[PDB]
């Protein structure tokens, strides 16, 4: 069957909720973005950054988890033969309490997350302020200055040599005081990548376009992957969203399968085509309908956990201007030819 | 009976005062908001913030206490088997002495409040500057810097894994020196909730509306619960307020039960429909009556401990602006569909 296992109706509420939460659906936009990211991570070819722009509810974190799992699986059979190598290191950027981004905490937490192998792996990193402990976790004193932590992190990266270096929620890199300091931040990241030869992938919302093409040297070693949502002007995206809604309602662990394709306009209204937001909405609706033990979902149930109109109104405002910066037209190509003299 | 026990008349005034103090009434708005908050807490579904707006007088603190007690009771049967688990942790935000909201005190106070379990729970907090003592109290020195406290708090939250982390008086988060820093504070909170996976509930007055819509990412993961007051324009709210007044006068431990529905316009005028204001005003009147040993209450007595016209006039100005900003109309949906192209 193309739907959920019908045995779940005998199971209690927790099992059905867990099954619905653990389900990952495959849709064309996620598939194409995942394929492009796999291709650009297989060989960087003189690139140090992968910029993955995606709106609030597009699947950035779950895509990162999926690619992390696939990279670990692909590295597994040679990992049995080759040691001193991690497949992938995944970290998330921290929004600082102060006005500027704190690089010392970033470096120490990068060392913490990267350095969790089995205790047999000993390297004796540089600087005397970094070591192991009795629990096997790296201890970092408060007296170590930021360049020392950077040198130790560089040594760890060049030793382990991960395939990619994931920095989730990369929007937090833009919290600085000086207007021009954005270039300096991105150049610091580039310098960290260069000595280690480690491809960095930055995941963030459409705000991350502030780091897009702020320098030509940085523009050369960056790859722009757009995790586009589903539009409404294009009938193809509308049909894709309808099909994904059909797949979701097909696999909902309920006694009566609800009909959802009728109010596709309603579902698009409160999700803007985002897939993670729709999945969370359906999860909350399922939890509500399963607390009352109702054999189905009712419209008013969708109205209960739907996001506020003000919330969805503004999300479109930042998405619409975000896509405008990412819009590539034939006019831009012609100006490139005219500037280059190739006309 | 539907009112206070008649035996309390023989008892001295202290027990009558205590009984009226601990007595709590159930009214439709409080029940609805409590149900919504419990539903949101049970299945956050990728939501890290619950912004519980409400005027000063709606019962936000009492709602928080009731939710805390009910969650503790619900988690008790599972807490019998599984240990090292706190059902719910609640802390109150502190208005800073300086011009900026300090985060070091917030982190250390969250660590103190979160970590008060049975001494058998040992988790060896990160960073060497935080440890236990001879009296079971968390020791935090001035040696540690704010990122170290943040790391220790994050590890403690991950290990304990509370269902929800209540933050009362959340308006104090707005004490900043820069306008963009107001968004930066919420970004820091979002990162803290993301990297630990702990649901954060913000309870505050209508000045919390400055945190309502800012960045699409924050809007996607921020539930809005409105603890609306009882308006006078709608007859249903007037009837509910009159029912609350009637049960309050039924529950007043006096030899003679006064007539309170008659002066419902006055109460309102001096309470604006907030149940907490009515409750504490009646508490003051009853305390005066018990001090005078008077069998009943008079309007005069109400006039003695009422609220000044200037006080209530400032109340309605902030409430009027708070409800105006939170007003969701069908016209607003029309622009959203028109902007989305679904009209
Ligand atoms: N294809 C998918 N299948 C199942 N669940 C998905 C899918 N895409 C997203 N989700 C859900 O979305 C959530 C993960 O967050 P998601 O990656 O969608 O966020 P984002 O909006 O891209 O980023 P951010 O966390 O920065 O706002 C999880 O609840 C996950 O179940
Ligand atoms: N439903 C209720 N039944 C009884 N007493 C209530 C009720 N709601 C509020 N109170 C009273 O209100 C007081 C608690 O403060 P309350 O939560 O009402 O304040 P608030 O205005 O919502 O919040 P804040 O403290 O931020 O101003 C107590 O005196 C409590 O007895
Ligand atoms: Mg995400
Ligand atoms: Mg209160």
Structure tokens at A110: 């990068």
* DSSP structural state of residue A57: T
Contact pairs from chain A to chain B, CB under 8 Å = 124
Phi, psi of A167 (to 5 degrees): -120, 95
Residue B276 to residue B282: CA distance in whole angstroms: 10
Best A310, A316, A317, A323 residue to mutate vs chain B (most B CBs within 10 Å): A310
Structure tokens at A72: 């670990």
Resolution (Å) of this entry: 3.0
Cβ distance A177 to A100 under 8 Å? yes
Ligand 3 center from residue B88 Cα (angstroms) = 25
Verify whether the Cβ–Cβ distance A233 to B191 is below 8 Å.
no
H or E element: which one contains B238?
Answer: helix B235-250
Verify whether the Cβ–Cβ distance B216 to A313 is below 8 Å.
no
Contacts of B270 (CB under 8 A, 6+ apart): B277, B281, B302, B306, B307, B312
Verify whether the Cβ–Cβ distance B340 to A102 is below 8 Å.
no
Verify whether the Cβ–Cβ distance A55 to B216 is below 8 Å.
yes
**Is residue B46 lining ligand 1, measured as CB closer than 6 Å?**
yes
With residues binned 3-state (H G I as helix, E B as strand, rest as coil), the percentages for chain A, rounded to 5, are 55, 10, 35
**Is residue A154 lining ligand 1, measured as CB closer than 6 Å?**
no
Cβ distance B86 to B160 under 8 Å? yes
Distances (CA, A) of B190 to A103, B88, B130, B184, B201: 19, 19, 24, 10, 12
Name the burial class of residue A45, with classes exposed (0-12), middle (13-18) and buried (19+) by CB atoms within 10 angstroms of its CB.
Answer: exposed
Q: Whose CA is nearest to atom 30 of ligand 2?
A: B276
Chain-centroid distance, C-alpha B45: 22
Ligand 3 center from residue A151 Cα (angstroms) = 31
Verify whether the Cβ–Cβ distance B188 to A17 is below 8 Å.
no
Query: Residue A93: its chain B contacts at CB < 8 A?
Result: 191
Cβ distance B271 to B277 under 8 Å? yes
Number of alpha carbons in the 13 Å side-chain half-sphere of residue A313: 14
* Best mutation site among B23, B34, B52, B62 for ligand 2 pocket (most ligand atoms within 8 Å of CB): B62
Residue B115 to residue A188: CA distance in whole angstroms: 38
Verify whether the Cβ–Cβ distance A92 to B194 is below 8 Å.
yes
**Is residue A29 lining ligand 1, measured as CB closer than 6 Å?**
no
Distances (CA, A) of A192 to A48, A186, A197: 10, 10, 9
Query: Residue B194: its chain A contacts at CB < 8 A?
Result: 92, 169
Tell me chain B's radius of gyration from C-alpha atoms. 23
Name the burial class of residue A294, with classes exposed (0-12), middle (13-18) and buried (19+) by CB atoms within 10 angstroms of its CB.
Answer: middle
H or E element: which one contains A210?
Answer: none
Residue B159 to residue A336: CA distance in whole angstroms: 55
**Is residue A162 lining ligand 1, measured as CB closer than 6 Å?**
no
Distances (CA, A) of B312 to A157, A170, B61, B129, B148: 63, 47, 21, 48, 45
Helix, strand, or coil here: B125?
coil
Instruction: Name all residues whose Cβ lies below 6 A of ligand 2.
Output: B 24-25, 30, 54, 56-62, 169, 275-276, 279-280
Residue B57 to residue A253: CA distance in whole angstroms: 42
Query: Residue B226: its chain A contacts at CB < 8 A?
Result: none
Helix, strand, or coil here: A227?
strand
Residue A7 to residue A5: CA distance in whole angstroms: 5
Residue A277 to residue A270: CA distance in whole angstroms: 9
Q: Whose CA is nearest to atom 4 of ligand 2?
A: B24
Nearest by CB to B188, from A92, A95, A274: name it. A95
Cβ distance A248 to A25 under 8 Å? yes
Q: Alpha helices of B84-230 — where are they, by DSSP H?
A: 103-114, 146-160, 179-196, 216-220
**Which method, experimentally, gave rise to this model?**
cryo-EM
Contacts of A217 (CB under 8 A, 6+ apart): A190
Cα angle: B153, vertex B214, B343; to 5 degrees = 135
Residue B66 to residue B34: CA distance in whole angstroms: 9
Contacts of A93 (CB under 8 A, 6+ apart): A101, A106, A167, A168, A169, A170, A171, A172, A173, B191
**Is residue A280 lining ligand 1, measured as CB closer than 6 Å?**
yes
Query: Residue A171: its chain B contacts at CB < 8 A?
Result: 187, 217
Helix, strand, or coil here: A179?
coil
Phi, psi of B139 (to 5 degrees): -100, 120
H or E element: which one contains A150?
Answer: helix A146-160
Residue A200 to residue A106: CA distance in whole angstroms: 14
Residue A128 to residue A148: CA distance in whole angstroms: 9
Catalogue the long-range contacts made by A140-149 (C-beta closer than 8 Å, 24 or more residues apart).
A140/A108, A140/A111, A140/A112, A142/B127, A142/B143, A142/B144, A142/B145, A142/B148, A146/A103, A146/A104, A146/A107, A149/A104, A149/A107, A149/A108, A149/A111
**Is residue A66 lining ligand 1, measured as CB closer than 6 Å?**
no
Residue A247 to residue A258: CA distance in whole angstroms: 12
Verify whether the Cβ–Cβ distance A92 to B188 is below 8 Å.
no
| Residue A90: closest CA among A32, A147, A162, A41 | A162
Distances (CA, A) of B56 to B23, B59, B206: 20, 8, 8
Residue B177 CB neighbour total at 10 angstroms:
11
Query: Residue A265: its chain B contacts at CB < 8 A?
Result: 337, 342
Nearest by CB to A169, from B124, B127, B194: name it. B194
Chain-centroid distance, C-alpha B298: 32
């Amino acid at each position: 069957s193309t739907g959920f296992p019908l045995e779940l109706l005998t199971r209690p509420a927790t099992e059905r909720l867990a099954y619905f939460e653990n389900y990952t659906v495959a849709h064309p936009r996620l598939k194409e973005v995942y394929e492009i990211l796999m291709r650009t991570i297989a060989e960087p070819a003189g690139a140090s950054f992968i910029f993955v722009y995606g709106a609030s509810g597009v699947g950035k974190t779950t895509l990162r988890l999926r690619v992390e799992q696939k990279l670990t699986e692909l590295a597994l059979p040679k990992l049995e033969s080759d040691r001193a190598r991690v497949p992938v290191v995944g970290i998330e950027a921290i929004a600082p309490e102060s006005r500027y981004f704190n690089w010392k905490e970033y470096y120490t937490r990068a060392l913490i997350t990267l350095e969790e192998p089995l205790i047999d792996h000993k390297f004796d990193y540089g600087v005397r302020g970094i070591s192991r402990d009795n629990f096997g976790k790296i201890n970092v004193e408060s007296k170590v200055v930021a360049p020392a932590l950077r040198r130790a992190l560089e040594n760890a990266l060049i030793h382990r040599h991960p395939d990619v270096f994931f920095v989730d929620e990369a929007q937090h890199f833009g919290k600085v005081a000086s207007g021009y300091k954005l270039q300096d931040q991105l150049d610091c990241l580039k310098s960290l990548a260069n000595m280690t030869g480690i491809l960095h992938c930055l995941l963030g919302t459409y705000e991350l376009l502030t780091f897009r093409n702020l320098s030509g040297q940085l523009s050369r070693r960056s790859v722009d992957i757009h995790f586009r949502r589903y539009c409404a002007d294009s009938p193809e995206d509308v049909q894709a969203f309808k099909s994904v809604l059909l797949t979701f309602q097909q696999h909902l662990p309920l006694a009566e399968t609800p009909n959802l394709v009728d109010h596709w306009e309603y579902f698009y209204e409160r999700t803007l085509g985002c897939i993670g937001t729709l999945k969370d909405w359906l999860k909350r609706v399922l939890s509500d309908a399963l607390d009352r033990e109702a054999t189905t979902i009712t419209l008013k149930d969708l109205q209960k956990r739907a996001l506020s109109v003000a919330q969805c109104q503004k999300m479109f405002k930042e998405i619409q201007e975000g896509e405008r910066q990412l819009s590539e037209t034939e006019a831009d190509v012609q100006n490139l030819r005219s500037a280059l003299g190739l006309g």
